[PDB]
Amino acid sequence: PTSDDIFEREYKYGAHNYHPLPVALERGKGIYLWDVEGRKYFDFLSSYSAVNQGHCHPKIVNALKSQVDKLTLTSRAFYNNVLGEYEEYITKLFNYHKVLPMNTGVEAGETACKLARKWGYTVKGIQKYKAKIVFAAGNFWGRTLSAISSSTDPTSYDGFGPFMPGFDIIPYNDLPALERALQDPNVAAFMVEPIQGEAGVVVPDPGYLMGVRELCTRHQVLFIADEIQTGLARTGRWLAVDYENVRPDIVLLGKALSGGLYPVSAVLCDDDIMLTIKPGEHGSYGGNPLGCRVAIAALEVLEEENLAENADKLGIILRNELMKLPSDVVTAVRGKGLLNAIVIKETKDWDAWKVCLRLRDNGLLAKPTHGDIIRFAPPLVIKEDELRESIEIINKTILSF
């Protein structure tokens, strides 16, 4: 079964909702992926930060193998013995009272919007169904009807309406725009990524998150920080918001929360928000004992291998080296920790897709995000010499055009 056969079979029997980079992977371990032909690649996407710990981390694998023989799912009609250990662990780790467990990132975002609205009505005193949520242009939090109703990307929402009302959109990285938007007393929450991943690793200016915190507090608005991609050591801190020492009202986690072994996501917040949802009023596989064992292990790997500090150090090296590329062809380099992107001067001859095809040819896997943006985001377990070898692949590729 060749790579072309894999491409062809999916084309026959699977929906056409993606056009992946033409490479067919069979095995992953740490920073490396192997295709069915046996070729070896640096993984410079890390499954959008879901494998921050590297592919198939043995401690996370071992947690899954141990728990799968015991109990994998009771549903929340009953209690399982694991969920509470995990809740105590993660809430103490991030210093919120409570966690609401879900499965995918978009489910955590949906839960956050529901909390915001219930809190708006029952605590802030907004009149029923006037509550607003404000989002930043370029945000991405998944693909339900609600999440695409807050999107400014036409490919995500065009042809899928009508849309969820009550969602307002302002520019990213713009404190006067947030201040203006929050003059409306019916706003219940502002949801924002500390760095916008799918928009192309858009890093806001120093001080933006501090201003977001202050403005949300000043106007009695919940600050929801979406760290589903940026959290869990990817940017060089436990949360990307830690760079500005700000405490969001709601923090969303996902992706790396399982090391890529299981869909686990989390909504963290204090009692005054969490308990506006009463028994029977929300839920989901959420909180199952298998995913909880996996996530405990995945978090322990992050702390025990000091991956945030490694991501900080190596991300400095990565951005410094990438800035040595010619401004003729690479027009920007941006990122924090090991979440980085370059922008290429797209001609009609070359574009980010062709660059990623050639990087693939040269043993490195990256994906383009808008026709001129390429993300460079290897697992945080990468070592300095591996990183420098990968950078030289990048340099060879870009300078080969």
Place this chain on the structure above:
Amino acid sequence: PTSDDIFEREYKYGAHNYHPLPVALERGKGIYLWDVEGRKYFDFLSSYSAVNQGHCHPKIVNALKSQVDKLTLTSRAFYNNVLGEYEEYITKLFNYHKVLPMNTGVEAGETACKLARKWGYTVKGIQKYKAKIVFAAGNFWGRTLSAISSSTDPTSYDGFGPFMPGFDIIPYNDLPALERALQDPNVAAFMVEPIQGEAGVVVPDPGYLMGVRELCTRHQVLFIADEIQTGLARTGRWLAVDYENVRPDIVLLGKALSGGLYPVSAVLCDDDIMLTIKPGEHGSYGGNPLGCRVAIAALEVLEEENLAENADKLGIILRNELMKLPSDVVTAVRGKGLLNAIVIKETKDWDAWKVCLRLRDNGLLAKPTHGDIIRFAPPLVIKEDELRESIEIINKTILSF
């Protein structure tokens, strides 16, 4: 760590979005659950049909353990070697051209609504954002803002608006009401459960699904059958719709699709619907190689152990025996296969909660659904003598009041 300690820890550190039956489970195998005190229970919920194959089926466990060491997640930016084998398998099994993989049931329902709307606009020719979707009262398909916008249960939507427009609701089990609703040419789809699970195992009348098929065809409306709970042998056929030999336009699968080992869900339909979504326009962990290995195994267990035929035979026995209970206390018995429920004459002295507490005391786990409905739904691997022992527990419990 006692059962009371487990209750207490979750109360401290977890959201209060459930009030589970007070029992703390540590181990599951086949039809049985064990709590942390070591007590043994018949599982008569089957995690809402996610463990149709029984808890921890060894073939599904073995598929997970084999694949977790190889590769668990590349994301859909690249191809993995497993997804296509699974797509070919499941599409050939249910005889649709294509599958769109997702993770949770509500994500499959969201995908279905998105397909319906895109198809409405781009194929049926509905004007943009006039498309309607019709749902049946009592439907349940999860807890996103969209799904609660179609709900008629106030606890699911009250305090969480404003709501998704374009969703219309008619009575269940009512062909004249569907016919009336479909006179509107802007209706793109009707979504319906062949038996409504969370509503209390509401079985529609013989011929309802045939009439739904005919009316949807007559009026150029997509018939979306939600078999996330009813499918995969639970009701005694591969799909609950097979009892009426009808072919929906979209079939949703979930829950048992993984044997409870992994959140896997599926959207099945033919090219003329599926391919209205283009690359970049929808997605998600969806289609990851670990979940695909699990789901292949889980489907093979269903076919190889002939669980649909077992569910049919034993469900006949279960309903016959339950009907022997006095009409003074049990006012209805309903179900197909091993998806069944009883309705109890709730006084102020007794209610379904107290019944389930006592069943728990007597070694059987069931959950109440509306204050007077108790579901009886053990895994399909149950044997006749185990089923009769469980029935006698039910009889002892109900007659003890």
